[PDB]
Amino acid sequence: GPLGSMSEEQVAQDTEEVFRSYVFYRHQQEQEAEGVAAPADPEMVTLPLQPSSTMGQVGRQLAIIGDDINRRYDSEFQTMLQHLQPTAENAYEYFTKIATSLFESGINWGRVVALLGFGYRLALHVYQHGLTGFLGQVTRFVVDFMLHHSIARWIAQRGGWVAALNLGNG
C-alpha cells in the first residue's frame, strides 16, 4: 500500500505506540516460551492502544520477527546490563549515550529495531532487579512528612527512635 506522507513529529508520536506494542508482544511471547524462566514485569502486560492499528501491528511484527533471534542474545545482555548497573536515576543518561553510539556511523532499519530491543531490555532489567527506585521515594516521603508535620519533634521529645526499643518488651 501507499507509504505515509509524514512529518518528523508525527513519526516521533507514532513511535510511542510502536514501542509500547512491541514491548507488550515481545514480553508475551517470552512468557509463553519460557514459562517461569521469563522475568515477571507487570508494567508490560497492558496494551494501551488499539492492537489492529497500523502502529500496533508494526510493533507486533517487529516482536514476531525477533522472537527466536532475540533469545540467543539474552546471556550476553544479562551480563552487559549487570555490568552497566542501570537505575531509574541514571537510565536516561545511559540510554542516550548508548543510542548515540549505536547511530554514530549511520541509520538503517536494523539499528532502529535494535534500539527498540534495547529499550525493552532496559525497561525489563530495571524493573526485574528492583532498580526502579520507588521504595527509595517512599522513604523520602516518610522522612519529609515526619520532619514537617511534627512527628519527628514528637519522637524527639520522647527520647528519639531508641525509645521504640521498649516496644515488644513487656
Binding site: 553510539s101 549505536l102 532499519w109 536494523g110 539499528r111 532502529v112 529495531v113 535494535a114 534495547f118
Partner: peptide, 25 residues
Amino acid sequence: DMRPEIRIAQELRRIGDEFNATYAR
C-alpha cells in the same frame, strides 16, 4: 574501551546490521 555502555552499543550495532542484512534486503 570496556565501558559497558560502549560494549552494549557495539553489540546493538552488530545485531542491527545483521537484522538489516536479513530483512531490509
